[PDB]
Structures are given as structure tokens and as C-alpha cells.
Amino acid sequence: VALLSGKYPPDLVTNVWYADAIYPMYADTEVFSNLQRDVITCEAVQTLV
Amino acid sequence: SFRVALAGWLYNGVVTTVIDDSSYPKDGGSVTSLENLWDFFILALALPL
């Protein structure tokens, strides 16, 4: 059904649409927290061994 | 704003007068939209001052 049915808004410009839709996603530090967690995990495993 | 821009010519080294962020076309823009083209035209005549 997804393959056979699909449409865009009547007017559309990909540049503007994506510049509007992606901006709210790029205000967060979760990935940086994940990197810090990965470092802590590696330090912990080396200390344990 | 016009008179403030005129008065700012005397204090180049102290204060910089720039066009507000909101005046620029929204989310990028496309030559595709009339509203957008006019924003560009308005910005183009006011930038040199």
C-alpha cells in the first residue's frame, strides 16, 4: 500500500522543506553524553581487567 | 531605523549596524516564491546603507 500510494504537497521545494524540518533536531547534547558514556565504559573495562 | 543607520556612520569603531536576522528570506528561500523574491528585493536596497 505504501509503494502504491504516495504524494507530495502541491507545491514543494526540498531545500526549504528540509531546512525547516531538520533545524529543531540539532539542539541537544545526547550524542555528546553518549561519547562520554563510551569513554567511561572503556575506562571501566580496562580498570576491571 | 533609517535615522539610526544615518547616525551610526559617526561611530564605526564603536557600534556596527547590521540588518536584522528576521529580514532575510525564511528558511533559505526559493526564487520560486513571490513573497520570497520581494524579501530579497527589500534587503538588497537596504544593505548598502
Partner: peptide
């Protein structure tokens, strides 16, 4: 009066741009 009553009724019944669509609006 009837003139403004008719005008108000017509405006209420009838009354409810160039820009690309966005996910916000």
C-alpha cells in the same frame, strides 16, 4: 438593522498565499 444583519450573516457564512509548505504550518 436588516442591512448590517444581512452583512454579518453573509460574512459569517462565507469568510473562513505564495509560500512553500513547511512541517511547522
Amino acid at each position: 438593522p436588516m442591512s448590517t444583519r444581512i452583512a454579518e450573516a453573509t460574512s459569517a457564512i462565507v469568510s473562513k498565499v505564495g509560500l512553500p509548505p513547511t512541517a511547522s504550518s
